[PDB]
Swiss-Prot record, chain A:
Active-site positions on this chain: 449 (proton donor), 525 (nucleophile)
Residues bound to Mg(2+) 2: 585
Gene it is expressed from: lacZ
Cofactor: binding details: Binds 2 magnesium ions per monomer. Can also use manganese. Binds 1 sodium ion per monomer.
Name of the molecule in the record: Beta-galactosidase
Cofactors named for this entry: Mg(2+); Mn(2+); Na(+)
Length: 1011, 204, 193
């Protein structure tokens, strides 16, 4: 039959989909959500054998264990056990596009398990097996007899094994196909793996049983009253003595309870459903669910006889909340949401696509701690526990059908084809049947990157018809088609339009107002956090707060999809596309997360936390105005801390209780403060701290902060006349300056400071020279490749202009002695193919104090691409333990990604000054720095800098962080100006004009002295 | 042009049409019809089938057609004749002036139906005036109403020809047979003959 | 596989639906809607045998004509030839309501046709068979090899027979089931044939 090459056959003998069941036989255990004896896990050690194609599988396997098999843990992805290589391809399918066929060489995983089953399970009732996730298709046999087949790697497939099992030892055999016609609908940008990767369980249900239940909560106009409506269906023999009771609990208190026999109301001319019943419970003053306060009740559905004997019970957590779109705004409990979201794939660097509770909880906690309130299931239904966690910790969820056909040409080739309507429909209908009772799910999505076809419009209406309680969205086909209730583009920019034919990506502000448009706009993906990225993130948040209909978005994305590999020595390292011999591949495009695969944050995470803060502030005189962006809670676990510092030195601080209503304001008057003692800029910093621990944060958690400059007293104090006068020694080849035990040497042929000595000790390994380039970030490279250059990418414009090859030509080098100092003047031109790209003019003034003042004036030709930076660099001879600076920090920050950093005095170990992006590039800059200290050296000015053991040359030549080696000394890059890093996307130049170094003439000045 | 979908004997009538597992089979009945007949000018309206209640499969399919062929309205009478799966109020056997307020799926007088609160669609009966035997009494009342009310745009009489079949007696002479005449049981007897013409096309 | 008791299988190997085609090789003919030499009718006399269930059909029939068969005209409804009774039921289904299953006694009409194909059709191009209406489901074999399956008694089922025919005489075999899961979607108030 080759059922895996027939989209008309997506399953054989599979049971209907339904919400999570446990068949408790005690109502109290159902109420408390405790483990049920009727739901057993088959996770653990199974037997496994890999074959290159299903035709190579021996028939003996059905009957008995293959001796060549291995024992492995399940769930698992067989690539993570080394049987075959995982493949990282973004859009291009990993198999030839020839629907609905797949390669003849089709890796087949043969799994089997020998296990016991109790007679009590067989003597009565139904025993089914549930596979929560099998990638991508499989056949199942039990005791050598064929049971069924299933597709859709992301939803559970269930089969009745009652007639196949015998008391005692039984054997399951599961033949899993890597590729199937289901693969055509699973072309998401992630590793392509296979296997039994989610839980396997056995569920025992009585013959007369609850087969489905739907829970709805509707409200009066001010939410003070609600009706809980539970529709329950049964399977089995109907009898008049059967009953259903639905009871609603708030903690240990029973709030409401209703019982009825089966028999629904008349539906049409033929009657009603004799096998269903609807219970309606009134609830006064319900405690409402939201991500701010995830209040939950518990609904227990009991199937029993009139005499009171329980047959079984099912249950769910219930959150009373209404989601609706009105007048162009997405409302939750009648208030307009501001979605601080993120897309999150299910990925573990060691386990592949297998999800565990600990990792899920870790992700949730980091999210909430970083001011996220929503998550999109990019791009498939998630492991079941995820929804339980979102319901209880409080996150709004976009649940998305497992349908993505990005690699088709055009993109909607299958979704516009009615013959693919059945397969697509099962991916949407079965997701809704499974997840519709979870309160955390607020929006349904029809999939991702599958163009817009008529099958989408058909499925959009299906959902609207079966579940009016949640909007439906879908981005394909231009983001604002008839299959979406929300304008939900990916990577549309804030102000800049990108008018692509047929599917333009308008500026979001403009998109809202196109003729006739009225819907809310929430980006399904925005700000691509690949590498050193998130440049311009604040621009999105300023727009979301200014425009009511701009209701936020889901950042792309949570966690890097890197995998662990082991070197010769056995030590681990982070791998990306192509590192497993997979080809074609899309290299580092699988790492776009705010966090590394192991959950350590990237510096961009802090920028997201600050821009997504729930408190906004303004200052006016001694008054600070705090505004709350919570919709539902008062600030009952928050106090404000404030501190006034001069150049890093604290002068005054205090604390004030915060009592701000949702959407309200609180004015706080600061106490008059004494004038400061010395010159300098006073800075006010405020932080919102939560004194009490919560389910997702520890006591002391800082949830929001803001700084402002207050008075500045400029220094007019005339230094103090130096004790000595530096001496100039001139020679044919050098200008040397001596002062005390210090000496500086300027080479007359190069025109740079080639060496500096403290006593007899050299301080430089490489001379101090201008630098106009940076080791290219992922955003500078884009999709450019050696094999296929993108001439529009920044790195290619710089290469082509000769920025990385230009060499300094000396124009002038003179020395003059002044009353109390020696002055060196230099001029250099940087040229390429006879073009002058940059001209750098400098003065070095060395005084009796031993300080060397450097003035730099650079000219940049107008027609050359704007440069990555305008600074100086050198390799210092020594290495020191710490770095201390007065500037923005403490974490890495760039011009277009520095809002979260604060101006203060920071001190970190040297390695914290290097950010270990898996794909190395320019990294670790800190901007807004007025003073930097390293070993005995101090640089003062108004600059940006980075400092580490790796040269820009090395970073640019190295593609994996594990292969970097510390160079001798310390490389210091000190910039008067540095280009933004961009990130609205990582495939087209995205650094905004205001962050490009296009001024033509630049000036900066630095003082280098010893401390 | 009407899809080959009728599940009238289910209880309730939409038991299959509201079941997603049956969406694929129903879908092929609708889509393959449109792909074959969409270039005929005579087809002016598509129909989703007949007497299969109103289920979510119907709303999905109504939208599919509206998306692939905006040139023709879509109608469907199941579930009360005026659901979200029909661009035309298209009742069967609703009377001219008399309401028949059945629960859940009332059959209003056609004149009254057009003006129920919020209603704005045209009304064309998918079936009206049951021509079984000596019948068609009251036919003129429908026509007077269609001509007086703009939005009453007519209807399709039930039906054209008797479904009688020929059998031969012991002398070999032919005779017209109806339900139960072939030993078929249960059967619905003469209800198979409701036409304006006899099975051989002679008019009634 | 009992494909006729599975609403998830409504066809196997069937070609996409499309508007009426005739593959004219002369544009003037296409303008005037004249008969096309590329569109041949297989209507006329076929071989037919009735059985009470698909389990009763002998395997030999796939390969050769059953001597017991009769010759009958096609298209036809086998009830009109007297092989079994037509049923007139309005609303109540003619089979027990137990979807998607049908009775085990399920009248099976076995139709076959021996017909010629010119080599010119087989040297190049695609030769397909078109069944405009088969009630209610069926399997098709050509020269003893299984080709495909179809449901929906009121739309055409088409199959590519290019890789199954040979120049000269060929034999089709069509096993028609009276009842199938498609019957649950065909409860119109009319004779059940
Ligand atoms: O430059 N391209 O040709 C190009 C084509 C498709 C692209 O798709 C983009 O890739 C991203 C990489 O992380 C994400 O997968 C995103 O969902 C997708 O739109 C991105 C760039
Ligand atoms: O009286 N009944 O119970 C009853 C139930 C269903 C009926 O259905 C009616 O039968 C007619 C008979 O020619 C047509 O088939 C019509 O489409 C159908 O609505 C008619 C009467
Ligand atoms: Mg398949
Ligand atoms: Mg994609
Ligand atoms: Mg590649
Ligand atoms: Mg009768
Ligand atoms: Mg079937
Ligand atoms: Mg021959
Ligand atoms: Mg009927
Ligand atoms: Na807004
Ligand atoms: Na990616
Ligand atoms: Na407080
Ligand atoms: Na690099
Ligand atoms: Na009229
Ligand atoms: Na009738």
């Amino acid at each position: 039959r080759r059922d895996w090459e027939n989209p008309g056959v997506t399953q054989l003998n599979r049971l209907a989909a339904h919400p999570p069941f446990a068949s408790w036989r005690n109502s109290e255990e159902a109420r408390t959500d405790r483990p049920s004896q009727q739901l057993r896990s088959l996770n653990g050690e199974w037997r496994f054998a890999w074959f290159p194609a299903p035709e190579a599988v021996p028939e003996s396997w059905l009957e008995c264990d293959l001796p060549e098999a291995d024992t492995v843990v399940v769930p698992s992805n067989w690539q993570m056990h080394g049987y075959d290589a995982p493949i990282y391809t973004n859009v291009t399918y990993p198999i030839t596009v020839n629907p609905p066929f797949v390669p003849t060489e089709n890796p087949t995983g043969c799994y089997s398990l020998t296990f016991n089953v109790d007679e009590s399970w067989l003597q009565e009732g139904q025993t089914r097996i549930i596979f929560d996730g099998v990638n991508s298709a499989f056949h199942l046999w039990c005791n050598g007899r064929w049971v069924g087949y299933g597709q859709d790697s992301r939803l559970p497939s269930e089969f009745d094994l009652s007639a196949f099992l015998r008391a005692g030892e039984n054997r399951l055999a599961v033949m899993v196909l890597r590729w199937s016609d289901g693969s055509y609908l699973e072309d998401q940008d992630m590793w392509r793996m296979s296997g039994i990767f989610r839980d396997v369980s056995l569920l025992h249900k009585p013959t007369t049983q609850i087969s489905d239940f739907h829970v709805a909560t509707r409200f009066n106009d001010d939410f003070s009253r609600a009706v809980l409506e539970a529709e329950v269906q049964m399977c089995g023999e109907l009898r008049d003595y059967l009953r259903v009771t639905v009871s609603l609990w708030q903690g240990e208190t029973q709030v409401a309870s209703g019982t009825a026999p089966f028999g629904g109301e008349i539906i049409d001319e033929r009657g009603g459903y004799a096998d269903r019943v609807t219970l309606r419970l009134n609830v006064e003053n319900p405690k409402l669910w939201s991500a701010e306060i995830p209040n939950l009740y518990r609904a227990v559905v009991e199937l029993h006889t009139a005499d009171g004997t329980l047959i079984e019970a099912e249950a769910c957590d219930v959150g009373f909340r209404e989601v609706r779109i009105e007048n162009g705004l997405l409302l939750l409990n009648g208030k307009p949401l501001l979605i601080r979201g993120v897309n999150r794939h299910e990925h573990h660097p060691l386990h592949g696509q297998v999800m565990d509770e600990q990792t899920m909880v870790q992700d949730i906690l980091l999210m909430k701690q970083n001011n996220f309130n929503a998550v999109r299931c990019s791009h498939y239904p998630n492991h079941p526990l995820w929804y339980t966690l979102c319901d209880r910790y409080g996150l709004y969820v976009v649940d998305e059908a497992n349908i993505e056909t990005h690699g088709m040409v055009p993109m909607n080739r299958l979704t516009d084809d009615p013959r693919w309507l059945p397969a697509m429909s099962e991916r949407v209908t079965r997701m809704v049947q499974r997840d519709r009772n979870h309160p955390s799910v607020i929006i349904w999505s029809l999939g991702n990157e599958s163009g817009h076809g008529a099958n989408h419009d058909a499925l959009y209406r299906w959902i609207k018809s079966v579940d009016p309680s949640r909007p439906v969205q879908y981005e394909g086909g231009g983001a604002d088609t008839t299959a979406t209730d929300i304008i939900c583009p990916m990577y549309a920019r804030v102000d800049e339009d990108q008018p692509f034919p047929a599917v333009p990506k308008w500026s979001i502000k403009k998109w809202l107002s196109l003729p006739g448009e009225t819907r809310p706009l929430i980006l399904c993906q925005y700000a691509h956090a690949m590498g050193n990225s998130l440049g311009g993130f604040a621009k999105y948040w300023q727009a979301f707060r200014q425009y009511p209909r701009l209701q936020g978005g889901f950042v792309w994305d949570w966690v890097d999809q890197s995998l662990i590999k082991y070197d010769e020595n056995g030590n681990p390292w982070s791998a990306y596309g192509g590192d497993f011999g997979d080809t074609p591949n899309d290299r580092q495009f699988c790492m776009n997360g705010l966090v590394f695969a192991d959950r350590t944050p990237h510096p961009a995470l802090t920028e997201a936390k600050h821009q997504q803060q729930f408190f906004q502030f303004r200052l006016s005189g001694q008054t600070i105005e705090v505004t709350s962006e919570y919709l539902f809670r008062h600030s009952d676990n928050e106090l404000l801390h404030w501190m006034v510092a001069l150049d890093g030195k604290p002068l005054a601080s205090g604390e004030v209780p915060l009592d701000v209503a949702p959407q309200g304001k609180q004015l706080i008057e600061l106490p008059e403060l004494p004038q400061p003692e010395s010159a300098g800029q006073l800075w006010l910093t405020v932080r919102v701290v939560q004194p009490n621990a919560t389910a997702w944060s520890e006591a002391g958690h800082i949830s929001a902060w803001q700084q402002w400059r207050l008075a500045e007293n400029l220094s007019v104090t005339l230094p103090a006349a130096s004790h000595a006068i530096p001496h100039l020694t001139t020679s044919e080849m050098d200008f040397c300056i001596e002062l005390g035990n210090k000496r500086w040497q300027f080479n007359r042929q190069s025109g740079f400071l080639s060496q500096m000595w403290i006593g007899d000790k050299k301080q430089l390994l490489t001379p101090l020279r201008d630098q106009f380039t940076r080791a290219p970030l992922d955003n500078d490279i884009g999709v450019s490749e050696a094999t296929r250059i993108d001439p529009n990418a920044w790195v290619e414009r710089w290469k082509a202009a000769g920025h990385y090859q230009a060499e300094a030509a000396l124009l002038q080098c003179t020395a003059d002695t002044l009353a109390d100092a020696v002055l060196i003047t230099t001029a250099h031109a940087w040229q390429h193919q006879g073009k002058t790209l940059f001209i750098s003019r400098k003065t070095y003034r060395i005084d009796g104090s031993g300080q060397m003042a450097i003035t730099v004036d650079v000219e940049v030709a107008s027609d050359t691409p704007h440069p990555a930076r305008i600074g100086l660099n050198c390799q210092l001879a020594q290495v020191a333990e710490r770095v201390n600076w007065l500037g923005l920090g403490p974490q890495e920050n760039y011009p277009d990604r520095l809002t979260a950093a604060c101006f203060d005095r920071w001190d970190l170990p040297l390695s914290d000054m290097y950010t270990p992006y898996v794909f190395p590039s320019e990294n670790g800059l800190r901007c807004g720095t007025r003073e930097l200290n390293y070993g005995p050296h101090q640089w003062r000015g108004d600059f940006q800098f980075n400092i580490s053991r790796y040269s820009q040359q090395q970073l640019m030549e190295t593609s994996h962080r594990h292969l970097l080696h510390a160079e001798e000394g310390t490389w210091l890059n000190i910039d008067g100006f540095h280009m933004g890093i961009g990130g609205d996307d990582s495939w087209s130049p995205s650094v905004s004009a205001e962050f490009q170094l296009s001024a033509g003439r630049y000036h900066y000045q630095l003082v280098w002295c010893q401390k």
